[PDB]
Design a protein around this motif. Structure first.
Motif, mmCIF file in Angstrom:
data_model
loop_
_atom_site.group_PDB
_atom_site.id
_atom_site.type_symbol
_atom_site.label_atom_id
_atom_site.label_comp_id
_atom_site.label_asym_id
_atom_site.label_seq_id
_atom_site.Cartn_x
_atom_site.Cartn_y
_atom_site.Cartn_z
ATOM 1 N N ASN A 227 0.797 -1.234 0.000
ATOM 2 C CA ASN A 227 0.000 0.000 0.000
ATOM 3 C C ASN A 227 0.818 1.267 0.000
ATOM 4 O OD1 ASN A 227 0.830 0.406 2.727
ATOM 5 N ND2 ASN A 227 -0.856 -0.917 3.445
ATOM 6 N N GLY A 228 2.086 1.175 -0.402
ATOM 7 C CA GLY A 228 2.927 2.380 -0.593
ATOM 8 C C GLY A 228 3.467 3.023 0.685
ATOM 9 N N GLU A 229 3.087 2.513 1.864
ATOM 10 C CA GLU A 229 3.641 3.064 3.111
ATOM 11 C C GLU A 229 5.098 2.642 3.296
ATOM 12 O OE1 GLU A 229 1.049 1.989 6.396
ATOM 13 O OE2 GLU A 229 -0.619 3.193 5.681
ATOM 14 N N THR A 230 5.906 3.530 3.876
ATOM 15 C CA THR A 230 7.352 3.327 4.028
ATOM 16 C C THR A 230 7.823 3.610 5.463
ATOM 17 O OG1 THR A 230 8.214 5.547 3.488
ATOM 18 C CG2 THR A 230 7.668 4.096 1.566
ATOM 19 N N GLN A 231 9.036 3.122 5.764
ATOM 20 C CA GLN A 231 9.665 3.343 7.065
ATOM 21 C C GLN A 231 9.757 4.817 7.450
ATOM 22 O OE1 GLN A 231 13.831 2.375 7.855
ATOM 23 N NE2 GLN A 231 13.314 1.409 9.855
ATOM 24 N N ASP A 232 10.435 5.651 6.639
ATOM 25 C CA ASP A 232 10.549 7.097 6.940
ATOM 26 C C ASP A 232 9.147 7.786 6.985
ATOM 27 O OD1 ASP A 232 13.373 6.776 7.285
ATOM 28 O OD2 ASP A 232 13.941 7.802 5.437
ATOM 29 N N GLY A 233 8.287 7.449 6.032
ATOM 30 C CA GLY A 233 6.920 7.952 6.042
ATOM 31 C C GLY A 233 6.168 7.589 7.324
ATOM 32 N N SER A 234 6.267 6.336 7.792
ATOM 33 C CA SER A 234 5.608 5.963 9.060
ATOM 34 C C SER A 234 6.186 6.713 10.249
ATOM 35 C CB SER A 234 5.658 4.448 9.319
ATOM 36 O OG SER A 234 5.266 3.770 8.136
ATOM 37 N N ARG A 235 7.488 6.886 10.260
ATOM 38 C CA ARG A 235 8.123 7.673 11.304
ATOM 39 C C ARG A 235 7.597 9.105 11.340
ATOM 40 N NH1 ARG A 235 13.180 7.599 14.442
ATOM 41 N NH2 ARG A 235 14.249 5.955 13.219
ATOM 42 N N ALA A 236 7.528 9.735 10.172
ATOM 43 C CA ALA A 236 7.069 11.111 10.071
ATOM 44 C C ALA A 236 5.591 11.172 10.498
ATOM 45 C CB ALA A 236 7.271 11.614 8.660
ATOM 46 N N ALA A 237 4.831 10.164 10.091
ATOM 47 C CA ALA A 237 3.441 9.984 10.549
ATOM 48 C C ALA A 237 3.353 9.970 12.073
ATOM 49 C CB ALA A 237 2.763 8.722 9.899
ATOM 50 N N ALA A 238 4.076 9.066 12.719
ATOM 51 C CA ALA A 238 3.993 8.939 14.183
ATOM 52 C C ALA A 238 4.508 10.191 14.873
ATOM 53 C CB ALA A 238 4.699 7.654 14.697
ATOM 54 N N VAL A 239 5.635 10.760 14.447
ATOM 55 C CA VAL A 239 6.049 12.070 14.971
ATOM 56 C C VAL A 239 4.883 13.079 14.927
ATOM 57 C CG1 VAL A 239 7.558 14.131 14.574
ATOM 58 C CG2 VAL A 239 8.579 11.838 14.855
ATOM 59 N N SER A 240 4.059 13.048 13.876
ATOM 60 C CA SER A 240 2.926 13.997 13.770
ATOM 61 C C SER A 240 1.750 13.726 14.701
ATOM 62 C CB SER A 240 2.358 14.059 12.351
ATOM 63 O OG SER A 240 3.390 14.262 11.424
ATOM 64 N N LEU A 241 1.433 12.442 14.839
ATOM 65 C CA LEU A 241 0.316 11.934 15.608
ATOM 66 C C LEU A 241 0.615 12.070 17.080
ATOM 67 C CD1 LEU A 241 -0.413 8.768 13.391
ATOM 68 C CD2 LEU A 241 -1.756 10.917 13.589
ATOM 69 N N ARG B 285 -7.169 8.433 13.781
ATOM 70 C CA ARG B 285 -7.750 8.334 12.449
ATOM 71 C C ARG B 285 -7.990 9.754 11.926
ATOM 72 N NH1 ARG B 285 -12.738 6.172 8.707
ATOM 73 N NH2 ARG B 285 -11.265 5.574 7.053
ATOM 74 N N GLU B 286 -8.754 10.572 12.657
ATOM 75 C CA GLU B 286 -9.052 11.956 12.187
ATOM 76 C C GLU B 286 -7.730 12.695 11.899
ATOM 77 O OE1 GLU B 286 -12.842 11.666 13.059
ATOM 78 O OE2 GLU B 286 -13.007 12.965 14.877
ATOM 79 N N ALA B 287 -6.729 12.487 12.746
ATOM 80 C CA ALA B 287 -5.489 13.272 12.651
ATOM 81 C C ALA B 287 -4.580 12.819 11.515
ATOM 82 C CB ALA B 287 -4.717 13.268 14.009
ATOM 83 N N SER B 288 -4.869 11.682 10.920
ATOM 84 C CA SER B 288 -4.095 11.235 9.795
ATOM 85 C C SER B 288 -4.873 11.257 8.482
ATOM 86 C CB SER B 288 -3.623 9.825 10.063
ATOM 87 O OG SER B 288 -4.768 8.972 10.121
ATOM 88 N N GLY B 289 -6.094 11.788 8.475
ATOM 89 C CA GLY B 289 -6.914 11.795 7.251
ATOM 90 C C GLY B 289 -7.330 10.373 6.885
ATOM 91 N N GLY B 290 -7.360 9.516 7.893
ATOM 92 C CA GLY B 290 -7.541 8.084 7.657
ATOM 93 C C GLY B 290 -6.294 7.344 7.171
ATOM 94 N N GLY B 291 -5.209 8.057 6.883
ATOM 95 C CA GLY B 291 -4.007 7.397 6.381
ATOM 96 C C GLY B 291 -3.121 6.731 7.407
ATOM 97 N N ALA B 292 -1.933 6.369 6.956
ATOM 98 C CA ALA B 292 -0.830 6.009 7.849
ATOM 99 C C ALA B 292 -1.222 4.908 8.789
ATOM 100 C CB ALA B 292 -0.300 7.279 8.620
ATOM 101 N N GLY B 293 -1.780 3.837 8.244
ATOM 102 C CA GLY B 293 -2.290 2.722 9.045
ATOM 103 C C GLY B 293 -1.253 2.033 9.900
#
Lengths: 358, 366
Positions: free
Chosen positions: A57-71, A91-99
């Motif tokens: 689904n196109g999710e990546t290590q650096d992307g997940s990190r940046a996601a969690a830093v944001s959340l 969920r609301e804070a990620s636009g439903g993304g970053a599973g």
């Protein structure tokens, strides 16, 4: 309040991959995952794993990190006892993304919440049982290498084999299924297309398998999600169970999958959208008449023990596909499931999911 | 010895007086004829549950439920409380999906013991989405005068939502009943509950009456019987307001069907129809299927009611709360539970399990 979330930490979890049971590995891949640590105000630490997989689904290590830093902000200062609210706020804070980042966070939260309670995460989910029987994956490649892997697997007790088919190397499929079946004739086959087949191509593959004698237990996501027609065709005709993975991305998908007969089984993964979503997908699937399957991305002992607790706790799962720790070279963790060939045991887990970093 | 194995289940009479009888469509309960189930773990933890069968609702009785719990003892005694879903699955299978109130009592007592010994409030176990709820209150069958009265008293205590029972022996009352109510509580939302004692024809007309008096009818609850699916479909289509399935939504399976057939737009979930496990699944299917959620109940004390509030507030997402039966009981034989301030239910003081404790018993060991 001792349950308030105090800090969310995130670090690399790079875990080398090897082929199970001795065999020659090759070029040396690594599972590029993340360890998320949640700390409560009373000092309790909970643990979760983000295992993003680009090809799924196109999710990546650096992307997940940046996601969690944001959340992180949206979680810090919330009560862990409010787990479902936090999962909503994630969920609301990620636009439903970053599973995968949200999965790591929710798991860490529930691990902290249940372990301070002296409660096993399998009991939290229901403790219908503490025992699962997993399949093992036969890695794509040669007819002769698939033979050898089917052989080794059978030797270690594995009676259920998940064989990747189609896409790259698809012309070899028939030969592969031939060699696997002749090597492990007592063995059950899951044919996993990962959306790589036409409807016609998947029918011909099942048909060839059965004419050989092979017990084809299940046909997994043979065609892509957008091929609703192909999914309905194959389900109607295959004469075996068909599983939605990509076609089951939400609880709203499983109602559709049910109402249209696009599959008979749902592959559920925690990493896809987190524990809250996965709990709902499982109730809808069981209500709707479909079989339940537990799976994952390329997960360490931590994320797979978590999935095991969910599946064993909820009960009623027909397929368990949680073999990934067999493919790992190292294990940076203490505790978790106990494995005896395909047999997985959670008896020994007494607090949270029982996995802790060494 | 494993601390969480179930060493003993007791069952005793839970008879609580109602001030006035609780009238529904063909059915009056003059005593809450309930049961108290106590589960004792090996480590000494007591867990408490309540069976509140309501014959007039679905045919379960005090004594039927008592005998069912006793038949079920083996599925319970000697089992691990950590395995609460296996226990519920095994009660459900040995019952054929009957004996809902007995099964709820048992699963409630197990979860209560499991969480309390763990120092986990039950609302947290269920998700912890909040700790506060706002309840409607019910205006039960009788003259259009005792309803006029009841509506003003409720409006004064703060009740912005009123559930009006309707149909049965006294359905000539209803149209005036609703007039006397709207005039006395002009700020109040209405739920017309039929408990299946209407036809569609009546239901729709009784709505239309209320609509043109200026009343905000917020929900039409189960106006027709459980196996008039066409009538539920029709009322959902033509009413112009939300319709709730109650008698028609007893399993997650019924809920899927209620969604697909457009037989309601709302589901009334009760722990007591099919136990807690059944109820968890129904909530998820209901939000998945786009249905609104209502948390309701049988004729329950503080015990089963607090269990329900923990459920609804833990889960989050409920549009209707109808948890008002402790207001109708002449006694409260329990300590703890939610704190009530008119319509307001607060769960903050519940620290472990559902927080409810009591102030001949059937006794069952092994």
């Amino acid at each position: 309040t001792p349950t308030l979330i105090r800090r969310v930490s995130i670090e690399a979890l790079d875990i080398p991959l090897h082929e199970p049971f001795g065999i020659a590995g090759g070029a040396q891949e690594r599972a590029a995952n993340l360890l998320v640590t949640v700390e409560l105000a009373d000092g309790t630490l909970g643990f979760g794993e983000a295992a993003p997989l680009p090809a799924f689904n196109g999710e990546t290590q650096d992307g997940s990190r940046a996601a969690a830093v944001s959340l992180r902000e949206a979680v810090v200062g919330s009560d862990a006892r409010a787990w479902r609210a936090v999962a909503r706020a994630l969920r609301e804070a990620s636009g439903g993304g970053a599973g995968a980042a949200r999965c790591a966070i929710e798991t860490a939260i529930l691990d902290a919440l249940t372990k301070r309670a002296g409660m096993p995460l399998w009991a939290f989910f229901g403790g219908s049982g503490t025992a699962l029987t997993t399949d093992i994956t036969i890695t794509t490649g040669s007819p002769e290498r698939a033979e050898e892997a089917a052989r080794r697997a059978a030797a270690m007790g594995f009676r259920a084999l998940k064989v990747k088919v189609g896409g790259r190397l698809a012309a070899s499929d028939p030969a592969r299924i031939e060699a696997i079946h002749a090597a492990a004739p007592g063995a059950s086959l899951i044919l996993d297309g990962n959306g790589g087949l036409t409807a016609g191509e998947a029918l011909a593959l099942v048909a060839h398998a059965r004419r050989l004698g092979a017990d084809v237990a299940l046909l997994e996501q043979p065609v892509p999600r957008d091929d609703w027609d192909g999914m309905k065709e194959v389900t109607r005709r295959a004469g075996v169970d068909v599983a939605a993975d990509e076609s089951a991305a939400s609880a709203e998908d499983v109602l559709r999958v049910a109402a249209e007969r696009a599959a008979t089984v749902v592959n559920i993964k925690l990493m896809k959208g987190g524990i809250a979503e996965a709990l709902d997908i499982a109730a809808v699937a069981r209500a709707a008449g479909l079989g339940l399957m537990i799976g994952g991305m390329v997960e360490s002992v931590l994320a797979m023990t978590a999935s095991a607790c969910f599946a064993a706790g909820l009960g009623g799962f027909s397929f368990v596909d949680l073999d990934t720790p067999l493919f790992l070279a190292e294990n940076p963790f203490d505790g978790g499931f106990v494995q005896r060939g395909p047999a997985l045991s959670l008896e020994g887990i007494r607090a949270g999911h029982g996995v802790t970093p060494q």
